[PDB]
């Protein structure tokens, strides 16, 4: 539950730049694939559990 955005998945540190005024990331299918940690500002990938 990252600042209200809820979901299930496995986190993973990514190499993406997130335009620091942004918080969430989405793919083509509008699925949340990258969420920023609101406490340490790093970007984490969202992958569905196997």
């Amino acid at each position: 539950n990252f600042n209200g955005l809820t979901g299930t998945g496995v986190l993973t540190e990514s190499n993406k730049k997130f335009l620091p005024f942004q918080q969430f990331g989405r793919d083509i299918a509008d699925t949340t694939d990258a969420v920023r940690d609101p406490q340490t500002l790093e970007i984490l990938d969202i992958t569905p559990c196997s």
Binding site: F21, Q22, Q23, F24, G25, R26
Partner: peptide, 26 residues
Amino acid sequence: QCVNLITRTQSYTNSFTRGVYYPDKV
């Protein structure tokens, strides 16, 4: 206290591709 010391005029022009902003923080 204020006084009317500006009274600026107005005109018209063509606004090209401008005024685009980020709709969300996605």
